[PDB]
From a paper:
Bromodomain-containing proteins are a prominent class of epigenetic readers that recognize acetylated lysine residues, typically on histones. BRD4, a member of the bromodomain and extraterminal subfamily, which in fact contains two bromodomains, is perhaps the most widely studied family member and has been shown to be very amenable to binding druglike molecules. ATAD2 was proposed from computational druggability analysis to be less tractable than BRD4, attributed in part to it lacking the hydrophobic region present in the BRD4 ligand binding site, termed the “WPF shelf”, interactions with which are postulated to contribute significantly to ligand binding affinity. We demonstrate the utility of FragLites in mapping the binding sites of bromodomain proteins BRD4 and ATAD2 and demonstrate that FragLite mapping is comparable to a full fragment screen in identifying ligand binding sites and key interactions.
Three FragLites (FL7, 16, and 33) were identified in the orthosteric site of ATAD2 and 17 FragLites (FL5, 6, 10, 11, 12, 15, 16, 18, 19, 20, 21, 22, 24, 28, 29, 32, and 33) were observed in the BRD4 orthosteric site. Those FragLites identified in the orthosteric site of either ATAD2 or BRD4 recapitulate a key interaction made by the endogenous and known synthetic bromodomain ligands with a conserved asparagine residue (Asn1064 in ATAD2, Asn140 in BRD4). Most significantly, hydrogen bonds to the asparagine residue in the orthosteric site (Asn1064, ATAD2/Asn140, BRD4) were identified by multiple FragLites. In both ATAD2 and BRD4, while the majority (22/42) of binding events involved ligands that contacted only one molecule, a significant fraction (FL2, 4, 5, 7, 10, 11, 12, 15, 19, 21, 22, and 24 in BRD4 and FL1, 2, 6, 7, 10, 28, and 29 in ATAD2) were involved in contacts with more than one protein molecule in the lattice. As such, the hits for these FragLites may not occur in solution.
Author numbering: 40 to 168
Write the structure that this text describes.
């Protein structure tokens, strides 16, 4: 895309060891599936296009970008070794939103609704088997 947006996060790397675990399967089949289809998912389904949104400071502030489209691809590509890596990606996505935006803001309200759902689902994450 625009040279003024950063390259998106890595979703493929043959040198990175990978595994499928039951926890990772749950994160794709239950957690991501639930959040992806939520009414408020759309701002989080792809990287922030700071040029199109006219937010030239976005990637000055947010140095650790993450989005659900990247997480979806990481899960589909079996990019992760364990569930914590994936959970950390979701946490980074929510924290980016809270850092950049204000407590009033529509996108924050949306992120908070998604994060509540995420927490509920992670509380039921199965033991690794
Ligand atoms: C309002 O700024 C934004 C912040 C994040 Br994080 C995602 C989308 C946005 O529009």
């Amino acid at each position: 895309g625009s040279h003024m947006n950063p390259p998106p996060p890595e979703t493929s790397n043959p040198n990175k060891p990978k595994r499928q675990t039951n926890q990772l399967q749950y994160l794709l089949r239950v957690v991501l599936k639930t959040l992806w289809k939520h009414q408020f998912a759309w701002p989080f389904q792809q990287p922030v296009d700071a040029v199109k949104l006219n937010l030239p400071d976005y990637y000055k502030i947010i140095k650790t970008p993450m989005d659900m489209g990247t997480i979806k691809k990481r899960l589909e590509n079996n990019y992760y070794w364990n569930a914590q890596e994936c959970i950390q990606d979701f946490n980074t996505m929510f924290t980016n939103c809270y850092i950049y935006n204000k407590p009033g803001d529509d996108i924050v309200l949306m992120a908070e609704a998604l994060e509540k759902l995420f927490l509920q689902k992670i509380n039921e994450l199965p033991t690794e088997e």
